[PDB]
Amino acid sequence: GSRRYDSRTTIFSPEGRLYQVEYALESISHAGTAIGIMASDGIVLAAERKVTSTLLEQDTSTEKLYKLNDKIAVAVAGLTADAEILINTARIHAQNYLKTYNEDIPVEILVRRLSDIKQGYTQHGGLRPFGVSFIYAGYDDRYGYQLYTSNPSGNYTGWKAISVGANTSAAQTLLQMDYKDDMKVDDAIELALKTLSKTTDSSALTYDRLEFATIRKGANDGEVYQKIFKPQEIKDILVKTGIT
Amino acid sequence: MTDRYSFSLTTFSPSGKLGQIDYALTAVKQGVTSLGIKATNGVVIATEKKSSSPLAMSETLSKVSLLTPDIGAVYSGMGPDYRVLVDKSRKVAHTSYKRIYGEYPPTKLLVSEVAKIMQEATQSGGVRPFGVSLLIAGHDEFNGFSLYQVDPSGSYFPWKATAIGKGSVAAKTFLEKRWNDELELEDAIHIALLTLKESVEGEFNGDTIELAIIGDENPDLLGYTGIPTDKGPRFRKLTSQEINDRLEAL
Amino acid sequence: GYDRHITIFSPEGRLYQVEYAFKATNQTNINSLAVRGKDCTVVISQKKVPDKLLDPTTVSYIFCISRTIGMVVNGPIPDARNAALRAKAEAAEFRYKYGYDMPCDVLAKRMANLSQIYTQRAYMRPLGVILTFVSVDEELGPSIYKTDPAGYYVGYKATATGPKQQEITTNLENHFKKSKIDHINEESWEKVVEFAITHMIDALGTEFSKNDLEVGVATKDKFFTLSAENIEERLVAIAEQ
Amino acid sequence: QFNPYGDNGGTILGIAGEDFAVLAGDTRNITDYSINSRYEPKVFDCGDNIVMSANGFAADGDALVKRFKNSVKWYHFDHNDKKLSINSAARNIQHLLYGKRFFPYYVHTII
Amino acid sequence: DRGVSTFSPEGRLFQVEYSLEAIKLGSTAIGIATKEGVVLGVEKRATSPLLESDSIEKIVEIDRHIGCAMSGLTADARSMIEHARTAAVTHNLYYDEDINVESLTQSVCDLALRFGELMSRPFGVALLIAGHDADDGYQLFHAEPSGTFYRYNAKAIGSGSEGAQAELLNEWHSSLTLKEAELLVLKILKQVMEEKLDENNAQLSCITKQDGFKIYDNEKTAELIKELKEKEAAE
Amino acid sequence: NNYDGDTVTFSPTGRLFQVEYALEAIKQGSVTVGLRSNTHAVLVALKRNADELSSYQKKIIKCDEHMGLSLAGLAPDARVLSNYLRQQCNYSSLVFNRKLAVERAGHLLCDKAQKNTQSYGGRPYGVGLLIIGYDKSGAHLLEFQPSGNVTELYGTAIGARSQGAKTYLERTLDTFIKIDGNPDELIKAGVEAISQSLRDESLTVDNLSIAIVGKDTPFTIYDGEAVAKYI
Amino acid sequence: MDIILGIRVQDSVILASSKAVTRGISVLKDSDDKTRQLSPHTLMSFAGEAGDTVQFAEYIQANIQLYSIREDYELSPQAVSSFVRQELAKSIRSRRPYQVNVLIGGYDKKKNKPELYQIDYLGTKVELPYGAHGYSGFYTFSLLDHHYRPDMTTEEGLDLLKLCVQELEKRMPMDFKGVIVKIVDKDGIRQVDDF
Amino acid sequence: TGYDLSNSVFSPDGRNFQVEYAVKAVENGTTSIGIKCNDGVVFAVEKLITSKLLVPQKNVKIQVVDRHIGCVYSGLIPDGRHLVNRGREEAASFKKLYKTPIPIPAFADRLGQYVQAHTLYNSVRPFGVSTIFGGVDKNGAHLYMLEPSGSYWGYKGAATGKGRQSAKAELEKLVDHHPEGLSAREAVKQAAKIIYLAHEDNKEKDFELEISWCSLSETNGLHKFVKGDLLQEAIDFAQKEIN
Amino acid sequence: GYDRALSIFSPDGHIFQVEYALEAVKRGTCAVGVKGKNCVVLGCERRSTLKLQDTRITPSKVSKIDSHVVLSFSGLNADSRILIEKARVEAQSHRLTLEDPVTVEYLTRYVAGVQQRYTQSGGVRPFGVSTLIAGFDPRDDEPKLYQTEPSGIYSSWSAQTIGRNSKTVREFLEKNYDRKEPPATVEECVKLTVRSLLEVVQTGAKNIEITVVKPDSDIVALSSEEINQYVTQIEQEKQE
């Protein structure tokens, strides 16, 4: 019968790893680097686009950074289309929680459910895993500012600063070197851009090859604001830290 | 009996590639050239109607398809795969949008739905990916004019102008030289016709070229009058005669 | 290569199972041809009954799909009958759901879609057949639309299918270069049939008795096949010429 | 409206002695004011020295007896030809009857 | 690979035969039937001395009149025991009587070939099912993952089984007392066990008509071990 | 070889190897014999034991008052198939008040086994059966094989070394076929037939199994002391 | 069932619930506690259809306790009351709805405020200074409209309650066998024993 | 390759090797035939006598469908039975909805479509029988033969199994020498002869002959087995001709 | 539904998918459980090629199943969440129907049953997880510690360890744990637990987690210093 053509996407190797998870991670390692840095007064998300053409429509574009709700955003490394499937799920999950409890969903709870969905594809159903790693940036009134990552294994962890995609090894070393606990958002912005600047596989880091977002306490008293940067705003903030 | 193929036929190789998606893209490479160009007041999508025998009537085979009155699509790769995607894309515009909001979806959201369908053929059990890339041009009230490319993976990108298939490397280079943010629709039609001559072997006239625009509302194409707010489809297929008129002043 | 057993892509982006289904198309070693009159659409196909034990009247590759649509198949008979039953059911359902007769081109598209599905979903094999649909459509007039195992389809001025299809094809293209029109400029379907048989004879370089052919004709509001007798009467008129 | 029940009359009676038991029933069968039969048995030998009557609506009575007789047959098949004791028959019959708790067999049963 | 329900060319089911190998790797279990009762004994085989051996449960009650010991992939046995217990209690509910030992065993064995492509593989555990009923008296059954069961006067299963069985072939006679059977099980267990048999690493149980199924405490088994060495010394 | 992975695959010579392998479990089975006169039909089966401490596996199963069978091969498969027969006999009784014709029993078994030889995932039955019964056209003997082939015979045998008994019955045909009105003489001939298939061993009291059905005799099974009469 | 009341004062919520359980012409029990603790700072009282009441209460309790363990955290009174409302709003369109009315009294530790929610079997939720289900409300609402003040102490709240229970024992046709009173505040939930 | 390991896979020539392997099982089976006659059809088959022990006359192989259709087949017998069971369900459902008994051409396509369906998927095996069947309907007599591929046609006469060639040659002579037609009683005799002739290619074990027929005049258009005087009369006419 | 028999027998009678699940356990961070006279302690290594971790929010390695029972594990982290959730649901369901919280044995038996089920159902692979489950039965003061593994076998342990280098630390506990005399206090029991982890771990920095469970739902996690005090103090007893 059909057994002949089944790759068996959910089995252990003799070493006890999950082939498809490992191979999905290998795929992700060639995607545009994305960085998240957490400050005491906000969070930065910065990410590098995949080798652009001059004709790409840069301002109506989105590939790396998506809004999950008003208090939570993600940066994507991996297959964009796989990521959109998970993002819509996550958006719906958030609204169900708000509908049930009349309260915005705590960041971890949203992160956990998405990670559980990923986990399921590694244990049953014989389908390939999602080729995606996320950096979650969000705020809630229990833990304040939070950063997490998840990858195709459905494993998630919390961070002060983290990268995913290409060159995370170099990026993690640079972040470790210059990160400090008492840091502010505007310092974190600079750290994120300088780190991408040094790990990038292109000759120089320009506005048109980036996506950028902040999550600040940055409006009127106690309430949180998400800013997905327009191209001109990235151009300015690139000059303002002297990379161009 | 019944489908016992409930496992994925696209999977990760040890190097991280998804073989079936790569191979689908290869089928797209062999496909006949198609392109799209975005002007300030319109979008043009074009391709070559490469006929299989001269006994075939190639007006009965439309490569450029209306999806909504303000959205059109063209492709490169496997024609039959494209035909069923058009059927599904048309339907999803209604089921997942018009039947809910009483209006046609904006371009990026319809593109989003098509991309979803193509992504699922990349992960669901017992199917292969679609062997096509799409270029979708459209207009909607709050985004204006837009042009998108959709690939076998389900990934899509917005373009100022681009091309796909056979001679796409050369055609993307040609368009880089000629595109600016001030192009008026008529200029973009002319550039489209020039770019397409590069990749076409045989006859190059209005019977071998298929070309449509997303431009001004066409009240004469509506079919009725008396609702002031209904002004007509912005999608218009250029006729054989209209294409030849533009080929002499070329 | 398991990419050669099921309908997944090969590294060069090809579907081998679809290509091999095209090769099964010629298993019967029959050629078929279709032309349009002013008023009619004629299809002819070779009829070969090797075994003397066969009841020759039951040997056919032409099908009445509806009152108005005929279909000729190139390919093995079990797949051909499968296609014919489905097309018959689809045409009947269309009439019931939508209140008018299914057009030839629409049935062609529908069957082409079903074939496309077999090229994408693994558990279904493609049918090893090519299907030529004919009618005199009430909107479009005389119509020929043809389907293959890739799920491709298109309308034709005229067409041919089978092992010696290229010979017949070029023969017909040469006529249409000369005539400068889209069809056989002829009033009666009897003469359009005579044209079809005549150009099959030149192109294949063989003569036919009354039992070597099989003929189907479409006019306004009916599609019908010819008896051995109506064909003989047609062969006789070509000879006296 | 369709009424799925009828009443076929008759009456039954069971008495136990020290080393025997009787189960008696009249043989008349009726609907309304008509006699259907003057001799239609409604007391049955079910095997393993068990007699059974299910009196009231005859169609239900016959169905029950048939199901119990069949139960005895499968008890042998499933438990190495063991004899079905009267206490075990009774408990089995309870489950046959209670399975139709919400659409009852309209009978009074005696074994 | 190859389907889970495939016959070998010798006409045996690959998966069943392979599960039989897994059972051979299992700890030893022995049962002996007498006219006074049936004894069931097992080798606990703790994988490490820190593991608290009384938590090793390889002898199990099914009903008052039916007991069970196991050998092989013992986690596979939980659902067979659960099914056994339900079949016994259910039979008592439907018929107001005790369920026959053979009937219980047949029911457990009905689960066995319910695998394929229903569970994904055969069970990798064999069972000794021991009990009393009024019709056939004291009985011992060996239930295999092939769905076959066999009545035995005595039987060993697990790693020391081919040795133990030859020993039981010699020692079993139709008139053994319960006490003789207890000692015999203890004796054959000490023979085939790796480690030195004591009351902590082996366990006894019996089922008698009068008191039903009982697992022996460690104090009680210790004495039967003491009584066994004294018997062996004294000739 | 490359064509024996499942039942859904023909070999290049048109064979079905998984069915052929199922047939092989029958050949390793303990021997059983069937034969009939015009008034009775008899089963004799040599039961096999595991060792000296074990029981001798039953090989004879009653299906109805007028029908039963003997098995050779996988016993659980005989239990499944016999249970199906019990149900079919039973359905004939409850619905039509009609004892199931031995011939229909045969057709029903053929069809049940056939399904498992044409679909993926299932396996063929690994057991052969001899079916006797007495119905409205007299005594019958049937041979079932898991290929689905069912055959009506005057006598036969299946299992290891069944070839001897089958030759014997082939010679004896004209004798036993007219042992009418005599139970113990049909049995003795059956016991004789089975003896032509013994080696290293002979028929004992916990080793022999006999069944008979006929004109005025319910299907009944004899084991233990009740077969001593026959050794 | 029958009598359940709630009053929210300055720094606590007080729930009073009758002790009688009646079937036909027999008071089967006179010490019934018509309440379940959902979390350490949230209490729910309930009345309505026999069987339904306790089954619903315990089902909610199980869900909130499960949430608590999973997140190692206590849901706010508002969040719990919304969860409960939704369960009842689903239920009312089921094959067999829960015929249960509830009061939820909780102390919100983030806000340092007591909160009282009244929810009927339809999933009709309202936050109130004081609440009642059943015929009780026809006496107690107007009484509390008169005597209630927003700034009262727990002790003033208990006196206000005594006034309610007195009126109900005077004018109500049934003998509801007194009330069990529970206080919910910053230190959790406790029961007054001599009322 | 390995194109032949799974049903429904096209080989590079465009063949389904599993069906062709099913044909081998058919060629390995006993001989069976049908002769179309004036107002009816006749079916016959060779039943190898494996042993003394087979009860003569009591292992019937020709099968009736509805009341007017006969089916015989060569190859795996159980597959043939399965196909006839399906044919019976198809005939019942046609009669239930349309009242008239199922026309033979109609019946032929029901079997055809069902057999063809077993070449569409790798989860089923093709049928290991070729089936000869037919009968009488409102348009006269019809004879059909149906292969493992689902291929079928109408036949003047037809044969399959080990002796298909000898039988085919014998059938061809009758078609040439009788262009006006063969009578039903005549066709029964010829059927016996051809089964005897075709038994040459299978002469290890001797055989039992079985015949059946439907004729508008001789059986009233119903399927009946030829037994008794008419069977022996035709056995004798066959005996006469091999000597 | 996807159906494949993924856990099947091999000719030698092994189920390779279950055995490879154990390899995943072996690769997981080490975990140990030690029971005292009146408490149980659970210790867990956390690997340290990860700095920039946020420790407030990363899932801790010991999970409360109910207020009186805890579970820790070695192996696939994502797999463990599924077992913990199921265990948590079962604990509340038990309280609902029996009106009593689960025994530690009962909860262990349930989790073990889940693990076993995944070794003989079509379409699923086994859990790449072994667990330690510890606590006190309701109204009981006798400490309880159980282990489960991918096969579904479970058992009680005086002390036990799982994960990478657990063979080294089982070695340690086997010579240092006296059945007759269990760590008669919290202090003693925590110490022995930290001593065993130091055989394998590195610096006792942000590398050792400890959780202490006492009777009647008394469960507390130590923070760095409280642990660090044990680290410092043992190292000073060592120079001898």
From Swiss-Prot, chain D:
Per UniProt, subcellular location reads as: Cytoplasm; Nucleus
- Role description: Non-catalytic component of the proteasome which degrades poly-ubiquitinated proteins in the cytoplasm and in the nucleus. It is essential for the regulated turnover of proteins and for the removal of misfolded proteins. The proteasome is a multicatalytic proteinase complex that is characterized by its ability to cleave peptides with Arg, Phe, Tyr, Leu, and Glu adjacent to the leaving group at neutral or slightly basic pH. It has an ATP-dependent proteolytic activity.
Subunit-level organization: The 26S proteasome consists of a 20S proteasome core and two 19S regulatory subunits. The 20S proteasome core is composed of 28 subunits that are arranged in four stacked rings, resulting in a barrel-shaped structure. The two end rings are each formed by seven alpha subunits, and the two central rings are each formed by seven beta subunits. The catalytic chamber with the active sites is on the inside of the barrel.
Question: Which family is it part of?
Answer: Belongs to the peptidase T1B family.
- What name is this protein filed under? Proteasome subunit beta type-6
> Which source organism?
Saccharomyces cerevisiae (strain ATCC 204508 / S288c)
Supply the gene name: PRE7
User: What part of the full protein is here?
Assistant: 20 to 130 of 241
Swiss-Prot record, chain F:
InterPro entries, alphabetized:
Ntn_hydrolases_N, Proteasome_alpha, Proteasome_alpha-type, Proteasome_asu_N, Proteasome_sua/b
Known Gene3D superfamilies for this protein? Glutamine Phosphoribosylpyrophosphate, subunit 1, domain 1 (3.60.20.10)
| Record GO biological process | proteasomal ubiquitin-independent protein catabolic process; proteasome-mediated ubiquitin-dependent protein catabolic process
The taxonomic lineage of its organism, from the top, reads: Eukaryota, Fungi, Dikarya, Ascomycota, Saccharomycotina
Alphabetically sorted, this entry's keywords are:
Cytoplasm, Isopeptide bond, Nucleus, Phosphoprotein, Proteasome, Ubl conjugation
Q: Does the keyword Ubl conjugation apply?
A: yes
Q: Which domain of life is it from?
A: Eukaryota
Q: What is this protein called?
A: Proteasome subunit alpha type-6
What assembly does the database describe for this protein? The 26S proteasome consists of a 20S proteasome core and two 19S regulatory subunits. The 20S proteasome core is composed of 28 subunits that are arranged in four stacked rings, resulting in a barrel-shaped structure. The two end rings are each formed by seven alpha subunits, and the two central rings are each formed by seven beta subunits. The catalytic chamber with the active sites is on the inside of the barrel.
Curated annotation (Swiss-Prot), chain G:
Alphabetically ordered keywords of this record: Acetylation, Cytoplasm, Nucleus, Phosphoprotein, Proteasome
Q: Which GO terms describe its biological process?
A: proteasomal ubiquitin-independent protein catabolic process; proteasome-mediated ubiquitin-dependent protein catabolic process
Give the Phosphoserine positions (modified residues).
Answer: S76
| Presence of keyword Nucleus | yes
Q: What is said about its interaction partners and assembly?
A: The 26S proteasome consists of a 20S proteasome core and two 19S regulatory subunits. The 20S proteasome core is composed of 28 subunits that are arranged in four stacked rings, resulting in a barrel-shaped structure. The two end rings are each formed by seven alpha subunits, and the two central rings are each formed by seven beta subunits. The catalytic chamber with the active sites is on the inside of the barrel.
Task: Report the sequence similarity comment from the record.
Answer: Belongs to the peptidase T1B family.
Protein name, entry field = Proteasome subunit beta type-4
Q: Which gene encodes it?
A: PRE1
From Swiss-Prot, chain I:
Q: Which SMART domains match?
A: Proteasome_A_N (SM00948)
Q: What PROSITE patterns would the database entry show?
A: PROTEASOME_ALPHA_1, PROTEASOME_ALPHA_2
Role this protein plays: The proteasome degrades poly-ubiquitinated proteins in the cytoplasm and in the nucleus. It is essential for the regulated turnover of proteins and for the removal of misfolded proteins. The proteasome is a multicatalytic proteinase complex that is characterized by its ability to cleave peptides with Arg, Phe, Tyr, Leu, and Glu adjacent to the leaving group at neutral or slightly basic pH. It has an ATP-dependent proteolytic activity.
Species of provenance:
Saccharomyces cerevisiae (strain ATCC 204508 / S288c) (Baker's yeast)
Any idea what this protein is called?
Answer: Proteasome subunit alpha type-4
**Gene encoding this chain?**
PRE6
Keywords of the record, alphabetical order, are: Cytoplasm, Nucleus, Phosphoprotein, Proteasome
Localization (cell): Cytoplasm; Nucleus
| Residues carrying Phosphothreonine | T58
Highest rank taxon of the organism? Eukaryota
